[PDB]
Amino acid sequence: SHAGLFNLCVVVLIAVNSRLIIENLMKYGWLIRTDFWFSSRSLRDWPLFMCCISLSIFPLAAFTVEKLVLQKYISEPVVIFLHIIITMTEVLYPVYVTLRCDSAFLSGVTLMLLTCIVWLKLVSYAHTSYDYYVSLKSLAYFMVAPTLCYQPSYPRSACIRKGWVARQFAKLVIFTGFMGFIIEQYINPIVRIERVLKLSVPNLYVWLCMFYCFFHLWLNILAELLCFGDREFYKDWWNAKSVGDYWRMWNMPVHKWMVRHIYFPCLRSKIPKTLAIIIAFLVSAVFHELCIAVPCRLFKLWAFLGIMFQVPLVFITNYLQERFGSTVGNMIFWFIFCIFGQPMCVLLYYHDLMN
Amino acid sequence: SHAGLFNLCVVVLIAVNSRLIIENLMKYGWLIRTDFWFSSRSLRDWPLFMCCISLSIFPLAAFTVEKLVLQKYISEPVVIFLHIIITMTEVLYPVYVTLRCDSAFLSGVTLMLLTCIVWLKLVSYAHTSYDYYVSLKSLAYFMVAPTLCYQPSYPRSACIRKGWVARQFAKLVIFTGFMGFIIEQYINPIVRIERVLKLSVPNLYVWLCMFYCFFHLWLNILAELLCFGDREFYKDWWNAKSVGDYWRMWNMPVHKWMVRHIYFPCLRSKIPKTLAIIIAFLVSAVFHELCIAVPCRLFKLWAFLGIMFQVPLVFITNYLQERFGSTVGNMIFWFIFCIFGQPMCVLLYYHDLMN
Ligand SMILES: CCCCCCCC/C=C\CCCCCCCC(=O)OC[C@H](COC(=O)CCCCCCC/C=C/CCCCCCCC)OC(=O)CCCCCCC/C=C\CCCCCCCC
Ligand SMILES: CCCCCCCC/C=C\CCCCCCCC(=O)OC[C@H](COC(=O)CCCCCCC/C=C/CCCCCCCC)OC(=O)CCCCCCC/C=C\CCCCCCCC
Numbered sequence A, B: 001s002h003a004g005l006f007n008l009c010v011v012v013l014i015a016v017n018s019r020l021i022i023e024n025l026m027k028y029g030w031l032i033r034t035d036f037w038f039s040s041r042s043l044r045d046w047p048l049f050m051c052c053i054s055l056s057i058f059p060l061a062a063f064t065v066e067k068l069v070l071q072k073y074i075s076e077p078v079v080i081f082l083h084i085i086i087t088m089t090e091v092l093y094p095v096y097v098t099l100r101c102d103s104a105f106l107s108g109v110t111l112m113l114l115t116c117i118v119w120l121k122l123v124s125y126a127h128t129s130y131d132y133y134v135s136l137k138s139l140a141y142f143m144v145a146p147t148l149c150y151q152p153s154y155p156r157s158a159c160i161r162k163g164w165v166a167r168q169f170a171k172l173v174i175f176t177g178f179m180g181f182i183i184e185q186y187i188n189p190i191v192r193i194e195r196v197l198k199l200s201v202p203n204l205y206v207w208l209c210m211f212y213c214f215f216h217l218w219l220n221i222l223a224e225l226l227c228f229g230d231r232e233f234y235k236d237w238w239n240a241k242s243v244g245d246y247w248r249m250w251n252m253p254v255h256k257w258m259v260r261h262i263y264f265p266c267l268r269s270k271i272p273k274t275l276a277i278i279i280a281f282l283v284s285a286v287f288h289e290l291c292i293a294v295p296c297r298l299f300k301l302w303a304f305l306g307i308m309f310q311v312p313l314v315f316i317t318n319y320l321q322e323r324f325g326s327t328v329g330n331m332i333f334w335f336i337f338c339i340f341g342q343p344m345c346v347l348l349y350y351h352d353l354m355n
């Protein structure tokens, strides 16, 4: 029920290194100096964080495709064409903003992540129903809601616990600081066969702390502050028998965005392989490549090819899970997630950024 | 439900070191050389493993205190005196065997562990009921049963699954070999403030692998071969809010041996502190000191004082868990279990053995 071994990992990586106090060298307010964003309100990161506010205008377009009634100057291919156009400019504008304006790493990462999330929300709004109104602020709650499925009707009318979520925010900032410490003093000295695994041992813990920061801490804080309900935002992916089992429980918001893309809304095409393994993962590869490669300002297509090489890993690991046990299935998931996977998909870009 | 992060730890400590194959130097059948027992059927370990067979004769005595009916030549203090005597000689004979006969470490460890388990089984038989028979082989099943409570009546009338248990035995031998590898190449080079934690980081993983070997693997194999049922042999101790909570779910056999020692069979004395914290833990300290110090053949009383100083940690950590959070309570449990606890309670004796 609780965390358990995560607190063990945190305290043992505190205990391994000699910085037992927050003052490492001198005058450090946190346990690490501010290395994630730093600077101030300057022109380096000014258009990147002002672009995310611009991502509010694309839901505001899409409601004005649907709040415009369908007998009022719009026809049946026109509304789909407007939906495709207002999603495509929504993707293409922050890419141009991040590539033109030279900036840091994390500001581009959060702008691009917000762009991908807003895109998935937009596509889930566009095709989810039958065809001045009474629901004009439903899209303004779905924008800052964790789910990627429209008309949730999940109970907002509840007592907001101002407590617990505050503790969760403290856990969030201290684990982001722990992420920064592991990055600064475990991976940065390495950059300037088994050496790849020696390089990739700390970034697996960095990804584990990333998942604890976003899906358990941040997504529950977001579901609590606007009192969504703190719902199931993932299942037990850490005991993934296969990597295809990993993809269906690491992200319960994205998986419900996939069900319209796989089941009865998309069951009119009747194809097993491309509809689940290729184009549903082409979506995730595009919105991985945009999230990792555009902030580094070099396009080597490594995150895209990493996810597209992780696509045959589904077919290999499901059969290897059927062949071997659920133990060796999870061990081969952890090894294939460590050395050729999502942590290494940011290790390559970090090495290309810091060299 | 599954293991999850344990397979991650196994594969990441495989990936850290360069021995990616079982042939480390030359001719190694396992992934470590045979260092646990080794030798052969020689006179060094001959009386130690022949003493465990002798531990069968003390249940065979105790049934002959109870199959001898209380109207047949025995009175009410005499049966209790016979019970005390046949438990005390049961403890004191393998101590003399291990101390007189100079031998290895693990043979003494398994002899003393069997002595402690047989003692707890004997005490839980002497006082568990009201007062040639029809149940003459019940004590010969309780001897090789995981529980420490008498008259279980748990269903042996079931089909033994020959599968899974075999897989569990393969997991057991490979995790014992992985234990030997971590001991050989992570702790042995260290022996000849933060240096104590640098010494005690691999032994926490060694204890984690010991718990996975004994309580999840070996005890389920034992409960399968005799088709006991593979019952609850521990609960989630890894998310212990306190060490006082850790002691009640690390060992569900020992905890039910403690419930008769605390509740209604032993509630006639009505004392809160000594009946739960001192003399219910003096048992565990004595049968820790017999297990770790007698095989090392030096009596520095370190495991006994380690458990007895681990006793006030219950009183500190219950209030510190009421004060701080369940996250910080688990982190302080993991730190207080790492540096001054059961893994360090074998680290001191291993340092004194290998130097
Ligand atoms: C006049 C005054 C001026 C106006 C003032 C206005 C303020 C301006 C603007 C603010 C933004 C605009 C707000 C508009 C949209 C609101 C959306 C929102 O609030 O959250 C909704 C969303 C969560 O998305 C994120 O948070 C992502 C961002 C988190 C990144 C880190 C960011 C730190 C943040 C701030 C730093 C500030 C600190 C000080 C520095 C300041 C100096 C520089 O939830 C979902 O729906 C998703 C659920 C579905 C999951 C999708 C798939 C899962 C994907 C990934 C898993 C991998 C994640 C790894 C994480 C990568 C990084 C390690
Ligand atoms: C004519 C032919 C000759 C005659 C042939 C006969 C053979 C003679 C004899 C064999 C024994 C006598 C059998 C008689 C009794 C049977 C009892 C039995 O079988 O198990 C019952 C018991 C389990 O106890 C153990 O196994 C403990 C032993 C495991 C130790 C390792 C041992 C490896 C074993 C063998 C090695 C051999 C390999 C080849 C080498 C050979 C060359 C040298 O279960 C419970 O009830 C307990 C549940 C309650 C829990 C109590 C509290 C929890 C405590 C601790 C947690 C910490 C554990 C740390 C682990 C310590 C190590 C790091």
Ligand SMILES: CCCCCCCC/C=C\CCCCCCCC(=O)O
Residues within 6 Å of the ligand: A109, A113, A116, A117, A183, A187, A203, A206, A284, A287, A288, A291, A292, A346, A347, A350
């Ligand atoms: C090694 C240094 C790490 C620095 C921080 C990490 C930077 C990149 C982090 C995450 C990239 C995106 C991961 C999740 C992608 C899914 C996004 C989506 O599907 O829309």
Ligand SMILES: CCCCCCCC/C=C\CCCCCCCC(=O)O
Residues within 6 Å of the ligand: B109, B113, B116, B117, B183, B187, B203, B206, B284, B287, B288, B291, B292, B346, B347, B350
């Ligand atoms: C660091 C090297 C490790 C070598 C193997 C470990 C040797 C000792 C292991 C366990 C000792 C006993 C631990 C549990 C004691 C409980 C016994 C009881 O309550 O009867």
